[PDB]
Design a protein around this ligand. Structure first.
Ligand SMILES: CN(C)c1ccc(C(=C2C=CC(=[N+](C)C)C=C2)c2ccccc2)cc1
Lengths: 180, 186
């Protein structure tokens, strides 16, 4: 089970959903095509299970890291820097978008997105309560921030990590200064 | 037209079935050609696709050339460029092929280098906006290169990762973004 999950995740990250075949998982995970079945049934269910684990791991990791930022302003900076460095969830976004632009309401996938946006919602709601900013539509600002940061993460993979952190911090500064 | 008919047919098939499901045997049979000849003009399925994107990219640039004339200030041009990126990607028939292609070859240094040259033309559009804006006194931005990359990546994140099917709400979110972003530059 655990060899199929690890190799699957890696191939999905490296090649996306379509280019990863159950045969290719079978060959590199030392297990039968019927071994993948029963444990996972289908390629889709294996991927969705990988996403469940990834988003739980990401959410665990953020629970621990957010104590390090005292203000919600600092938490926005921190969360966005961590999205670039984390091994969890963010590395799969290209596989996730592809899977999303193919699959049949499994879409009920939207509770995976709402979780990923909810970190910003807490940040922005709590910042509202602690007088750090005034935001009337937190739901909208949360979605905008999350998807914007996701674009900065996902579309700058080619680059040096220090420069990516520098671009991201400038984004965070512009964005927060724009809530003024 | 060996090369041009393969381009047209490949485009149709990429629209119809996406990048991954479309094979070179299909492209060549419907073009009345051969895989040896496809290999000759484009070497790979990957490079054939990249050539289509370059022709399409050129069409997008000429559209923006004539559409930006209706936005008086560079501030208005920023809002418009972002809304156009969104609405165009929403109906664009090659969009799914582009996503499939990108999500497969984004970590391949060979292809991913050529993807960057395409992407940089988008960032250049933003650079012109922000530079012209500096000159016109609409804002004062020190690193126009950084800000242009940030805008381009941020706008396309909003377009790609947003799941709201309602195009009205998507447009509203993008215009809010443009407002926040520009307000942050002051
Ligand atoms: C048809 N059409 C107008 C467009 C089509 C595609 C793009 C994209 C993109 C993403 C990031 C970019 N950056 C960071 C410069 C540039 C382009 C893009 C979206 C999803 C997957 C790959 C690329 C934009 C416009």
């Amino acid at each position: 089970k655990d060899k199929i999950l690890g190799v699957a995740k890696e191939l999905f990250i490296k090649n996306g959903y379509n280019a990863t075949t159950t045969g290719e998982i079978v060959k590199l995970s030392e297990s039968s095509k019927g071994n993948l079945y029963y444990h996972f049934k289908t390629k889709e269910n294996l991927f969705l299970e990988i996403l469940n684990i990834e988003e739980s791991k990401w959410q665990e990791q953020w629970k621990k890291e957010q104590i390090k930022a005292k203000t919600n302003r600092e938490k926005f900076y921190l969360y966005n820097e961590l999205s670039l460095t984390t091994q969890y969830y963010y590395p799969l976004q290209n596989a996730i978008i592809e899977f999303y632009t193919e699959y049949t309401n499994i879409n009920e996938m939207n509770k995976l997105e709402n979780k990923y946006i909810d970190a910003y919602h807490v940040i922005f709601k709590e910042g509202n309560l602690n007088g750090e900013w005034s935001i009337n539509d937190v739901n909208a600002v949360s979605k905008i921030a999350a998807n914007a940061v996701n674009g900065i993460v996902t579309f700058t993979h080619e680059q040096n990590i220090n420069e990516r952190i520098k671009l991201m911090n400038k984004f965070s500064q512009i964005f927060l200064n724009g809530l003024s």
